[PDB]
Every structure is written in structure tokens, then in C-alpha cells.
């Protein structure tokens, strides 16, 4: 299938080349994909209009100045460079298309009379009411993202340990195994906050035997950065805080469209349909600019793990090239 | 950022500036005894050999460890400021490096030093033969001679002309930044230093074969591009219309020695009042100027002492 | 606060007072951080036109503090 | 919502004041953020008059935080 | 708010507090940023007298924030 | 409050405090702004005192923000 | 009010709450602007006594802002 | 528990007040602090272009304090 | 407020608090304003001995602002 | 830290705001303290790979304030 | 305020709160003023020993500000 | 309040907030002061590698103030 | 009584808040004042050893604000 | 509050908030004043042992400010 096989084909040159006992950076691309696709989840005013933006890059229009015949690789970028990122352009298209579907996902909780009391067809324009303005409905989608972050923490920490296993370097080995002790304690404390009255007495007692696992083989490794374990927990907190912003900020972009493409004038009567566009034109571009900032959250997510050592080459230089230059063509 | 620690280190180092009474006792000395006198002070901890070139190198080693590490020991707004004073010596260093590259002669017989541009940067530049390689090496620290260079070198690659234009663009950029740090002592120092530079530059670079208006610079008083050309042809009638300067009394004088003495002594006193704003770059600005003028003076005395030149040939200069 | 006229009670109001400090201080810092990167950055974007984009990204990067204060405040009012 | 104690209830008023702190702080910080970007902006026109657009889009970025907050407060206190 | 301030409401008062932040921050930040351009501006006119005008269009740019406060102002007036 | 009613109460009092925030901010920013253009003025005299005139003309421009800010306060804290 | 009786009103006292921000802030600002201008004056006396006149006109411009800040307060509170 | 003033009385009231302060201080200290790494950070990308990745991880290091302070406040203020 | 004793009534009390901010802010300003001319002034005395008076007159001027403020505060106190 | 009936209630809550203070102050002080040192230091290791350990142990010293505040808060309000 | 030492209500206590500001910030600002001017007097003594006296008298001028703050607070709490 | 507090509730809890303030301001000062010296210290450890220790030791002294306030609060708010 | 009480009451606490600003702000101010004036002073010893005595008198003068601020707090919280 | 033993009671509790301001601010100023002297001292020992002492006597002088704050708070709390 084009979505996985096409970028997967370029990862084949790096399959062939290993430089450590950690497994080659092939899993990275499907870890990237959910969060990347999931960055567009807006409504009528954002996600469902995004269609136009995808078609420019993977297709060819005249609308933008340096883009003429993309088929001859004409871009801002050099003609060759544009040919190199055809693969990416296709994946940008899949990203925009998965963004349109998560617009219809979005209108499951913002339209139909089978899911909420909101009209199945409004008398003005679809997405006249927002019901993702209720704290709890919005929260559950946040907590869904947070979980994917716990998984990525596990994925990295197995990879951290594997490096010393097949490279035969004990220091890294000891660090990857000991840190997973910390994970039992992350999951305990979390259960008590995610379900609320789930633990709190079954993770105050058990927490204590979970903390000893955390440092037990870390002390064989020695480690004369004892405080630095605050920052290792922090790294966990950074994957949570980034998936969270990707969720919350996702819904938030759409809730600004509440006074943008629906209703913000009169009494909310039928005439707002042809009055709202007054505001629409202004918000649109402002919104566009800030959601480009939201698509940088993926590569910021990779950099916590990639560039701060959790099974990967990067951390203070080192052989192999940054994941940014790798995904750039893929 | 941060000048607190830097300023504190620089005050302690003042404790070892060479006093006026040094240079009084020194005039009565020959070369062997000056060296015995010199070795007591802090330049003395880097003094080597009984040859004159070995003394010159001993001055350089002192300057390296006490002035050239100073941009490195601080960052942010502080580094930019310390840099701006050091840039002017980097400009002597670049001109010499560039000339060794263009005329195909060794790396050697240049005067380098470390600061913003380190010893290895200059070595890298020499080793990047292509003008484009050269241009990118220099862009690495991002320093204002780079940005002046990028603009300048596109127009023309004629060596003497690259230097001249590199100086004017480099000074237009500097004048703004130094006025812009909003320290009154530095701004007063800057207006006179500039007025002084325009005058001095015309005397040195007459007969080069270049334009007059490729040696003018931003901060200039009554002086203009037309007057600079007047001076470069050799007319001192520009000075009798020049006024408001405290340099106004060096007007009417043709004698080279007497003019340069007067410019230099004013700038010395001007900088010394930089301690009335010790905050910020004041204290380091004062320090750099006093340590340069002591090194010049070490060199004037040594030569006078070795070769049997008159006491009065340097006694007049050492007391302003 | 996601709900601050869609739910009433003095209880909801207290939550907004405490949370309001968080998003507001976070908004102050983010704006300033960007401004500082932005003053410095003009020299880099000007000279390297093959590296202006590193500078743009760096201005963006402090955003994560402001949006986190806003979200935690949004979730907590109208309850989780 | 709005503060009221003689036109509506106290319950609404408590929420309004709490949400106001946030705009309150943010207004302070964008004002400060404005100084630094204004300093920087003249160099961009000075060096490259021809490439004005890159400088305006930069200048635009801290302005967004305050305007965005104002719009957030309009959605919340426009219902009641 | 709603035209009344001699018989006005505690509601009207809340809008006035929120409104005071908008125009006030915009003025503070705009005043300072514009002045920074002008300050730079003595150097700017000096260097290039011919393109004094570009420096001026930049100095007018932080005004957009000021107009924005007024625009909020207009909508919010006549209500609550 | 009002700028003609010599007597009022609690309601009126909130508007008066709130519109009072705007003038305070405008005043803050004009004083800090005036300072920059003034620091800049020393250059103007020094380099070529023919550019002393220019410095004065920049310097008037931040005054507009405090006089403008007083207008916003004046209409709103005295409607009718 | 006045130091003499027959003056004072609650609405006027309330404006006094808000307006106090202005006199303090305007005063801070007038002083800092004024001091920079004072720093220019050291240059004005040293270079040209004859053009001392530039410093005086300069020094007069920040004076507007405290005097103005003061003048609004006295009318709104101290009217009668 | 929650931040309220009328589900637990005074005992509750005190929690809401006090607890907001903490988040406030943590947000404030990071915000001022971030600006220093970002402005310094420009020299590092310039000199060590090859190592842009080391600069990014330095900018990330202050994020960690604020995120802990938010997670804790988020849990504590919805503890019930 | 009353200039002496108790204010009596909560309203009179609030007015006392509000006039206190104004003297406070004006005084804080006096000090910082003075530092900027004061550091410069020493040079004015040293260089331009003939004009030692000039540094002094400049320094006296932000002091006048805090006294001017006391007259406003004194006048409102003893009455509403 | 913990959530439950016996680790979340109103009695328990007084413990939690008090413990919450500790994170807050430490977050503030460490964030500023770490950043300037961290910004200069990351540069040092980045240029020279022979002083690389030194910077890192230096950096840890300001961090201590957050670990000691977090540790106190966790222990005391991990029981009740 | 006046005749306060363990008596007076909420009302009296509020004049003590407000008035406290004037001396306190005035001492704060005094400190600053002294710190820049004082630093410059050291520079001056260093160059010319003979004007030990000028530096010491000038350093006594910001002392006046702290006393000025005291006078304000005392007057406003009890009418002399 | 705390669990090792000799008695708990709102009354102990109140003490906890105010006394918590003092260590917080201590923290604010230590951290910003520490940032200045740590940033400069990097050149010293970089040059004088065998004497890294002296730089480490200079850094600890302002920290002392923050720890000390933590102990006083601990004792006062909890005898056991 | 005169800054000295035992069990105390709520009224004595409101007087305490007001006066507590003075001891703090005087001490704060003295802290900025010694650091500048003193730091230029280490240099006076370095350059000209004889006149170590000029450094000691300079330093001594900012001490006068912290003692005066403490005395005001003592006086004020117990005048007749 | 009280240092006599325990610290409970509502009556103590207001006093506790008020007294913390002096300790807080006094530490804040001591922090700034001290740090620069601590870092400079290492430079003194490193450069020249014989005048190690000057840096040492200077350090003591901000110590006095934090202890004065502690002492005022201690004496008032529980008669010492």
C-alpha cells in the first residue's frame, strides 16, 4: 500500500547499515504517523477546508507563484530537491486526507441527532453548535493521546537497553533496564489520576518497591548524575505534555471557529449565514499561521527521545544523521 | 549575559597596571636594565629572550591571556560588547590574513591573536583557498566583519579595494552599535575616536591608489567626503575650518609627531573616565585602552634604550 | 477555563481564579521569550539565507508553556 | 460571565473575575514583548529594504497572544 | 458597555476592567516599540535619508494592536 | 462613574477603577518610550548637529498614546 | 476633594483609586525620560553652550506626561 | 480537593487561594529564564551548524520545571 | 478616607488603599530616575566644572514629582 | 501525589496546598538559576569536547532546589 | 493609622496597608539611586583623590527620597 | 499545613501560605543572582579545568538562603 | 504593642501587612545599593591601595535605609 | 504566628501573612547583593592570595539584611 511502503522503501538504505547494538531506526516512521495525522482534527473552518492545501503540493496549480508544473518539479525549493520530496509530498497529501476524515470524526460529536441534540442539518451551515465545549468530552480525547505517550516511553526504553545487549557495553545496558523500574511507578501513580479512585493506597505502598527497582542496577552503573533522574521523569512528562497540546490545541483551533464560521452576529438567526464571513476572512489566515506551529510538535516529540539518548545515535553529535534530515524526503 | 564577574576580574587586574612613575624611572635606563625592571611586572611573567623580537612575542603572550580571552568568558549582551572593542584589532588581523592568502606568501608574518576570531579560525581561512570557502569560514562566528565582507566582496575582488570598503562598511555598522548600547562615556569616546580616525586614516593611506570616499566613516563631525579627498591630496586648510573638536589646538600644525601625540593623549583621558560608568562595558573599555598604550610605550622605550636614541625622543610622548 | 458561563456556581469561579494565574504568567513568559530570540535572530536570518528557517523555528519553540497553561485550565473548569 | 450583584447573581461574577486575571497578566507581558521586537525590526529594513515581508511576519508573532486571549474571553463571556 | 455610567451596572464595570487592559497594553507596547524604531531611526535617517519613509511605515505597524482594542471595544459597547 | 455626576455608589465605582487601568498603562509606556528617543538624541547632537531637528520630530510621536488613552477612559467612564 | 469642605463624592473617590495608578506611573515614566535627556545635557554644555537651547527644549517634552497625569486626577476627583 | 469556597467552606477557600500562587511562581521563573537560552542559542547554531540538535536540547531543559508544577496543580486541584 | 483615625464604612477604607498606590509608584520612580542622571552627573561635575550646577538641577526634578503627589494624597484625605 | 477519599479530602486538602507551595517556589528559583548557566555551558561543551563533563556537573547544582521541594511535598502529602 | 497599636477595625487597618507603600518603595528606589551614583563616585575618587568630598555629598542626595517617603506615610495616617 | 504539623486545619494552613511566601521571594532573588555568576563562571572552569571546584563552590552560597527559609517554615508549621 | 506581640489578633495582622513592606523594601533596596557601590569599590583598593578607607565609608551609607525601614515598621505599629 | 511552641489559631494566622513580607523581601535583596561577591572572591584567590580578605568583609554586609528580617518576624512571633 502506498502510505507505509513508500516511506518504508527509503528506510531500506538504513536497514542495511547498523552502527550499534540497538536495532535500526526503521520503527520510527509508524510511531510518527498517528500523531502526525492526528494534528488536524478541526471542523468546517479548518480541517474540511484543508483539502485545498494538500492538492497544491502533491498536484500542480498556478495559484502559488513558484509552483507551476509540480510534475516538472517546480517549487521554492530547487528542482532536484522537489523531485527528492515527491515521496514526502504524497505523505503530506495522506496527512491532509487523514486530516479531512478526522473532520468527520470531529462532526460525530458536533453534528447528528443520534449522538447529541445538535441538528443533523443546521439551517445556516454545518457545525453551528459545538459540543466538544463540555470539559469531559474534550478531556477523553486528551487522555487518549496521553496513553500513546506512555507507549513511546516504553518503546524507547527497551531500545536503550538493547544497545548494550548487542554492542556489549554494560553502562547503557544498566541504564536501560533500571529505568523501566521507574515505569512501574509511572503507571501506578497514573492509574490513580486517570480513573481517580482506582489506587492511592495501592500506589503508596507499592510505589515504595517500584522506586527500588528504579535505581537498583543504576548503582551498578554508578551514575554521578543522581539529580538528573528528575529530568528523566521530565522527559516522560514532555511526551505527555506534547501529545496533550496536540489534542487540546487541536480541539481549541476548532472552538475558535465557533465565532468564525457559525454564529457570532445577530441573535443567531438565519441571516448570520451571509454575515459571518466578515469575521471568517480574518480568522482563517490567523488560524492557518498558528496550526503550522502545531505540526512542529511531531518532530519536537521525536527530539526528546532521538536527540537525548533512548536507544538512538543522537546525543551530542555522534555518527548517523539527525532524524529531521531523514524524514525530510520520506 | 553578565558583566559582574568579568568587571570584578578586570578591577583586580588594574592593580597591576604600570604606573606613570615606572616610565619616569625607565627613561634613565638602558635596555639591559629596562628588561630587569620589566620582569618585576606582570608582562614579566611572559618575558623571554634578550632579543627584541623575543620581547615583541612576550608582549603578545601577555595580551593573549589578559585581553584576548575576555569575549570568551561571558556571553549574550556582554560578549557583543567586549567583541566590539576587540573587532577593531580583528580588523588588523583579517587584513593581514587576507593579504597572505591573495599574494600567495606564507601564513606566517601576520599578527593574529585570539578573541572573537580564534587562532584556528584564521588557520581555517588560510586553508580555504576559494573566495567562497573563505567567505563561509568567516561567516561561522557571525561577527560584523563577516556581514560587511559578504556585501563587499560581491562587488569586487581587487585586494587593496576589498580592504578599504571592508573598513567603511565595518565602521558604518559599528558606529550605530556602539552609540546604541547607551552608555554616555562610550558615546563621547566614540565621537572623538571617529573624528580622530578620519584624520589619521587620511595621513596614512595617502598614495595608495584608491578612492578618498572609501575611507570615510559614520560618527564624523564637520568632516565630509569632499574634505577627506582635500586632505588625501595633502592640504591642511581643512583643519582651519575644523573646530568644536578638542583637537582644535592641533590645528595649524604640520609636524606629524605633535599632531598624533595630541589625538592619542585626549582619547586616553576620555576612556579613563569610563570608570565613572564602571557598569557594563566601561570598565573593560578603559582597561583595553590603558593596556594597549602601555604596550606601545614598552616598545618605544625598548628601542630607544637599545639603539641609543635620545631620551627626549620618547620622554615627551610618555607624559601626556 | 472551557466553561466560565456555561456552568455557574461559586465553585466554578474559584477554579477559574486559581487556574487563571497559571495561564496568565505562562502567556507573559512565552511572549517575552519569543521577543528575546527575535531581537537576536535578525542578524542570522539576514546573513544566512540558507539557514533563516532554524531562526524561525527557534522563535516558535517557547509556545509549549503558554498552551499547556491554557489547556490545564480548560480541562479543570467544567470538570474532568 | 460578568460581575453582578444587583443585576444577576454572585455566582456568575466570581467566574468573571477569575478568568480576567489571565488576560490581565498577558497584557503586561505582550507590552514588554513589543519593545524588543521593535528594536530589532529597523535592522531588517536597513540591511535588506527589498525583503520587508520576512520582517512583518516576524513582528506579527507576539501580537497574536494578546489578540487570541481577548477572543477567548469573548467566547466565554458572550454566552452570559 | 451599554450607555450608562451614572446609573451604570456592576456588569458595565467588569467590561470596563477587561477593556482597560486592551487599549492600555496596546498603547504601552506600541509607544515603546515605535519609540525603539525612532531611536534607531536617528541612525537610519543618517545612513540612508532617501529611505526615511520605510522606517516610518514600520514605526506605524504596532498601531494594529491599538485598532484591534477599539474593534473589541465597539462590539462590547451597547451590551451588558 | 461620571465626569459630571458628583455622587454615585458601588456600581459606578467599578467602572472608574477599570477605565483607570488604561491611563496607568499608557502613562507607563509613554514615559519609558520618551526615554529611548531621548537617549538617541545625544547622537543627534554629537555626530552632526543638523540631525538634532529629526530627533525632536520622532520624539512627539509617543505623546499620542497617552493623550489617546485618556480619550478611551473619558468616553467610557462617563456614558450619558 | 479639597482640603476645605464642600467637596468629595464616592464616585470621585473611586476614580481616585484607579487614577492613582496614573499619577505614580506617569511620574516614574516622566522621571526616567527626563534623566536620559539629562544624560544628553552633559554633551549639550560640553560641546556648545550656545546650543544649550537644544537640551532645554528636549528636557521640556517629558514634562508633559506627569503634568498631564496630575491634571486629569484633579478634575475627576477635586472637581468642586 | 477542588478549588471552591462553598463546598467545604473557609477550609476550602483557603486552598483555592493559596494553590494558584504556586503555579503562578513556577510559570513566572521559567518564562524569564527561557528568554536567556533562546537569545544565547543563536550564537551556537551559527558556530556549530552541524550540531543544531545540541542547541534544541538546551532550549528544552527549562520546560521541565513548569510542566511538573502544572501536573502537580492539575492533580491536587482535582484530587477529590 | 480620613486623614486620621479610622475611615468608617468599607467604602472610605478602599479609597485609602487606592491613594497609597500613587505615592508609592511615584516614589519608586523617583529613585530609578535619579540613578540614570546621577551616574552621568558625576562626569558632568568632573569634566564641566564651570557647569557643576547643571547636574544638580537635573537631579532635583524627579524629587518634585513625589512631593507633588503628596499634595494630591493630602487633599483627597479628610474627605470622600 | 495520591488521589483517594483518604488522600483527597478537605482535611487532606490543607496538607496538599501547603505541600504544593514547595514545588512552586523551587520551580521558580531553579528555572532562572539553571537557564543562564545552561545557556553559556551547552555552548562550551558544543565547541570543546574536552571540557564536556565539567559543564554538566556545574549545571546540576541549581537543580537541587527543585528535588528538595518536590521531595518534601511528596512525602508529607503522600499520606493524607 | 493614627492611635493604632492593637486597636481599630478592618477600616483603620486598610489605611495602614495603603500608606505603608509610600515609605517602603521610596526606601527601595533610594537604594537604586544610590547604587548607580555611588558607583560613579568611586570612579571619580579613583582618578582624582582631591574631590573625595563631591562624591560623598552627591551620594547623600538620594537619602532625601527615603525621608520623603516617611513624611508621606506619617501625614496620610494621622493628620499633623 | 502538613502531616507532621502539631495541629492542622485552616488556621495552620493559613500560616503555611504566608510563611511559604518568604522562602518564595528568597528563591526569586537567589535564582536570578545565581544565573549571572554561573553564566560568567563557565569561562573560568573552561580555562581552569583542574580548579573546577572553586566555580562550584561560589555557586552554593546564595542557595543557602533558600534552604534556610525552608527549615524555618518546616519548624514553625510543624513541631514534629 | 510596638512591633512586638504574642498570641495577637486579626487587627494586629492587618497593621503587620502594612508595616512589613517597609522592613523588606528597605532591605531589598539596601541590597541593590551595596552591590553596585561596593563592586566599583573593590577596584579602588586594587588601583590605589592607600585609600581603602574611601571604600569602607561608601559601603556604610546604604546601611542607613535598612535600619530606618525597620524603625519605621516599629514606630508605625505603635504610635499614639 | 508564634515561636513559643505550636502556631495554631486564626488570631495568629493573619499575623503570619503580614510578617512574611519583611523576611521575603529582605532575603531577595541579600540574594542579589551576595552572589556577585561570592563569584568575584574565587577570582581574588585565583589571581592574588594576599588580598583575599577584601572580598571576605564585603560578603558579610548583605548577611545583616536577611537576619534583620528574620529577627523582626521571630520577636513578633511569640515574644521571641
Coordinates of N, CA, C and O in Angstrom, one line a residue, chain E residues 16-72:
Chain E
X16 N -15.5 47.3 31.6 CA -14.6 48.4 31.7 C -13.2 47.9 32.2 O -12.2 48.3 31.6
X17 N -13.1 47.0 33.3 CA -11.9 46.5 33.7 C -11.1 45.6 32.6 O -9.9 45.7 32.5
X18 N -11.9 44.8 31.8 CA -11.4 43.9 30.8 C -10.9 44.8 29.7 O -9.9 44.5 29.1
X19 N -11.6 46.0 29.4 CA -11.4 46.8 28.2 C -10.2 47.7 28.5 O -9.6 48.0 27.5
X20 N -9.9 48.0 29.8 CA -8.9 48.9 30.2 C -7.5 48.4 29.9 O -6.6 49.1 29.5
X21 N -7.4 46.9 30.0 CA -6.3 46.0 29.6 C -6.1 46.2 28.2 O -4.9 46.2 27.8
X22 N -7.1 46.2 27.2 CA -6.9 46.2 25.8 C -6.2 47.3 25.2 O -5.2 47.3 24.5
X23 N -6.8 48.5 25.5 CA -6.3 49.8 25.0 C -5.0 50.2 25.7 O -4.1 50.7 25.1
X24 N -5.0 49.9 27.1 CA -3.8 50.1 27.8 C -2.5 49.4 27.5 O -1.5 50.1 27.3
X25 N -2.6 48.1 27.2 CA -1.5 47.3 26.8 C -1.1 47.8 25.4 O 0.1 47.8 25.0
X26 N -2.0 48.0 24.5 CA -1.7 48.3 23.1 C -0.9 49.6 23.1 O 0.0 49.7 22.4
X27 N -1.3 50.6 23.9 CA -0.7 51.9 23.9 C 0.7 51.8 24.5 O 1.6 52.4 24.0
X28 N 0.8 51.0 25.6 CA 2.1 50.8 26.3 C 3.2 50.2 25.4 O 4.3 50.7 25.1
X29 N 2.8 49.0 24.8 CA 3.7 48.3 23.9 C 3.9 49.1 22.6 O 5.1 49.0 22.2
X30 N 2.9 49.7 22.0 CA 3.0 50.4 20.7 C 3.9 51.6 20.9 O 4.8 51.8 20.0
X31 N 3.9 52.4 22.1 CA 4.6 53.5 22.4 C 6.0 53.3 22.4 O 6.8 54.0 21.8
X32 N 6.4 52.2 23.1 CA 7.7 51.7 23.3 C 8.4 51.1 22.1 O 9.5 51.4 21.9
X33 N 7.6 50.2 21.4 CA 8.2 49.6 20.2 C 8.5 50.6 19.1 O 9.5 50.7 18.4
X34 N 7.5 51.6 18.9 CA 7.6 52.6 17.9 C 8.7 53.5 18.2 O 9.5 53.9 17.3
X35 N 8.9 53.9 19.5 CA 10.0 54.7 20.0 C 11.3 54.2 19.8 O 12.2 54.8 19.4
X36 N 11.4 52.8 20.0 CA 12.6 52.0 19.7 C 13.0 52.2 18.3 O 14.1 52.2 17.9
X37 N 11.9 52.2 17.3 CA 12.2 52.3 15.9 C 12.7 53.6 15.6 O 13.7 53.6 14.9
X38 N 12.2 54.6 16.2 CA 12.6 56.0 16.1 C 13.9 56.3 16.6 O 14.6 57.2 16.1
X39 N 14.3 55.6 17.8 CA 15.5 55.8 18.4 C 16.6 55.3 17.5 O 17.7 56.0 17.3
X40 N 16.4 54.2 16.9 CA 17.2 53.5 15.9 C 17.2 54.4 14.6 O 18.2 54.4 13.9
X41 N 16.1 55.1 14.5 CA 15.7 55.9 13.5 C 16.6 57.1 13.2 O 16.7 57.5 12.1
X42 N 17.3 57.6 14.2 CA 18.3 58.7 14.1 C 19.5 58.3 13.3 O 19.9 59.0 12.4
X43 N 19.9 57.1 13.5 CA 20.9 56.3 12.8 C 20.4 56.0 11.4 O 21.1 56.2 10.4
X44 N 19.1 55.7 11.2 CA 18.5 55.2 10.0 C 18.4 56.3 8.9 O 18.7 56.1 7.7
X45 N 18.0 57.6 9.4 CA 17.9 58.8 8.6 C 19.3 59.2 8.1 O 19.5 59.7 7.0
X46 N 20.3 59.2 9.0 CA 21.6 59.5 8.9 C 22.4 58.7 7.9 O 23.1 59.3 7.0
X47 N 22.2 57.4 7.8 CA 22.7 56.4 6.9 C 22.1 56.5 5.6 O 22.8 56.7 4.6
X48 N 20.8 56.4 5.5 CA 20.0 56.4 4.3 C 18.8 57.3 4.6 O 17.7 56.9 5.0
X49 N 19.0 58.7 4.2 CA 18.0 59.8 4.2 C 16.9 59.5 3.2 O 15.7 59.8 3.4
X50 N 17.3 58.9 2.0 CA 16.4 58.6 0.9 C 15.2 57.6 1.1 O 14.1 57.7 0.6
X51 N 15.5 56.6 2.1 CA 14.6 55.6 2.6 C 14.2 55.8 4.0 O 14.1 54.9 4.8
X52 N 13.9 57.1 4.4 CA 13.5 57.6 5.8 C 12.0 57.1 6.0 O 11.6 56.6 7.1
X53 N 11.3 57.1 4.9 CA 9.9 56.7 4.7 C 9.6 55.2 5.1 O 8.5 54.9 5.6
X54 N 10.5 54.3 4.8 CA 10.4 52.8 5.1 C 10.4 52.6 6.6 O 9.5 51.8 7.2
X55 N 11.3 53.4 7.3 CA 11.5 53.4 8.7 C 10.1 53.9 9.4 O 9.8 53.3 10.4
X56 N 9.5 54.9 8.8 CA 8.3 55.4 9.3 C 7.1 54.4 9.1 O 6.3 54.3 10.1
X57 N 7.0 53.6 8.0 CA 5.9 52.7 7.8 C 6.0 51.6 8.9 O 5.0 51.2 9.4
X58 N 7.2 51.1 9.3 CA 7.5 50.2 10.3 C 7.1 50.7 11.7 O 6.5 49.9 12.4
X59 N 7.3 52.0 12.0 CA 7.0 52.6 13.2 C 5.5 52.7 13.4 O 5.0 52.5 14.5
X60 N 4.7 52.9 12.4 CA 3.2 52.8 12.4 C 2.7 51.4 12.6 O 1.5 51.2 13.1
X61 N 3.4 50.3 12.3 CA 3.0 48.9 12.3 C 2.5 48.5 13.7 O 1.4 47.8 13.6
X62 N 3.0 48.7 14.9 CA 2.4 48.3 16.2 C 1.0 48.8 16.5 O 0.4 48.3 17.3
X63 N 0.6 49.9 15.7 CA -0.8 50.5 15.8 C -1.9 49.6 15.6 O -3.0 49.8 16.1
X64 N -1.7 48.4 14.9 CA -2.7 47.4 14.6 C -3.4 46.8 15.8 O -4.5 46.6 15.9
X65 N -2.5 46.7 16.8 CA -2.9 46.2 18.1 C -3.9 47.2 18.8 O -4.9 46.9 19.4
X66 N -3.6 48.6 18.6 CA -4.3 49.6 19.1 C -5.7 49.6 18.4 O -6.7 49.7 19.1
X67 N -5.7 49.4 17.1 CA -7.1 49.4 16.4 C -7.9 48.2 16.8 O -9.1 48.3 16.8
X68 N -7.3 47.1 17.1 CA -7.9 45.8 17.5 C -8.6 46.0 18.8 O -9.8 45.6 18.9
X69 N -8.0 46.8 19.8 CA -8.6 47.0 21.1 C -9.9 47.8 20.9 O -10.9 47.6 21.6
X70 N -10.0 48.8 20.0 CA -11.0 49.7 19.7 C -12.2 48.8 19.0 O -13.3 49.1 19.4
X71 N -11.8 47.8 18.1 CA -12.7 47.0 17.4 C -13.6 46.0 18.3 O -14.8 46.0 18.3
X72 N -12.8 45.4 19.4 CA -13.4 44.7 20.6 C -14.3 45.7 21.3 O -15.4 45.3 21.7

